[PDB]
Write a protein that binds this ligand. Structure first.
Ligand SMILES: Cc1nn(C[C@](C)(O)C(=O)N2CCN(c3cccc4cnccc34)CC2)cc1-c1ccccc1
Length: 269
């Protein structure tokens, strides 16, 4: 559709999930959003905000437990660096098979995997320089017990895979790209609840008011949600919000039309 409309959206109005299998490149996305050609870019500022928020949630607040399931990880691992200090076991999941290939290369420490070292050092500094980068990466690698296929739009997001009830379900920068509408968004929060213990933690971080995002020239849909619609959907899905933060920092105009980002910690009712 020549960029007139997002990829895989001509017929339905929103990028169909199989576009994440046929027309999606994790390496290109990683280079664009997590490897920086210049300092103090909007992408770098957003990543530092996410990292300080994850550090605050997992290391300063009471978000601790046995199992954490990361839903819609993408090809990234920055969102698990601080979580590995408070959770014994981490299960990482994604819809995209090429994202899963990217995570398994990182898990094996394959030379062809994306290099997360500068981000790891950054988290080590936040945490008090208790350890250096390599010791921090090895701890996270040992904490990641399973790499699974997921689909937030299904009532059993992880299929037949058996798992104990989780203490936390984390989802960063996934739901705006996976849910075509507010009813799907609410159903997806309910589907995630099925993986969670009663009183378990739900941690969500995503963009606000974004109808699309770019990976170079490739455009993908995003559910344009404001902060009120996110709170109403989280409350309707069966959770009580403990804290909710909105930041005005947005991605570069050539990468997305978001109007900030939100972070929330909720508990299953
Ligand atoms: C930055 C940024 N990074 N990303 C994450 C990214 C590249 O979209 C991704 O790899 N994802 C999430 C979607 N995901 C999925 C897609 C279809 C269905 C899924 C069913 N279950 C689970 C996951 C599903 C597959 C992994 C989004 C932004 C961003 C978003 C809005 C505005 C501005 C920036």
């Amino acid at each position: 559709s020549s960029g007139l409309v997002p990829r895989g959206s001509m017929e339905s109005g929103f990028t169909s999930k199989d576009t994440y299998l046929s027309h999606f490149n994790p390496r290109d996305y990683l280079e664009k959003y997590y490897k920086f050609g210049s300092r103090h870019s909007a992408e770098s500022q957003i990543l530092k905000h996410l990292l300080k928020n994850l550090f605050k949630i997992f290391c300063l607040d009471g978000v601790k437990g046995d199992l954490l399931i990361d839903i819609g990880s993408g090809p990234t691992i920055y969102q698990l660096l601080s979580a590995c200090e408070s959770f014994k076991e981490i299960v990482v999941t994604d819809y995209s098979d090429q994202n899963l290939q990217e995570l398994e290369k990182w898990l094996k420490a394959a030379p062809a995997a994306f290099d997360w070292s500068p981000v790891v050092t950054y988290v080590c500094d936040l945490e008090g320089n208790r350890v250096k980068g390599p010791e921090k990466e090895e701890k996270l690698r040992q904490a990641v017990k399973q790499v699974l296929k997921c689909d937030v739009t299904q009532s059993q997001p992880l299929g037949a895979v058996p798992l104990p009830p989780a203490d936390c379900v984390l989802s960063t920068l996934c739901l705006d790209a996976a849910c075509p509408d507010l009813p799907t968004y609410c159903r997806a929060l309910r589907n995630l609840g099925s993986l969670l213990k009663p009183g378990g933690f739900l941690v969500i971080m995503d963009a606000l008011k974004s109808s699309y995002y770019m990976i170079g020239e490739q455009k993908f849909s995003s559910l344009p949600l404001g902060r009120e619609a996110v709170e109403a959907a989280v409350k309707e899905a069966g959770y009580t919000i403990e804290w909710f933060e909105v930041i005005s920092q947005s991605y570069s105009s050539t990468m997305a039309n978001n109007e900030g980002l939100f972070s929330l910690v909720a508990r299953k009712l």
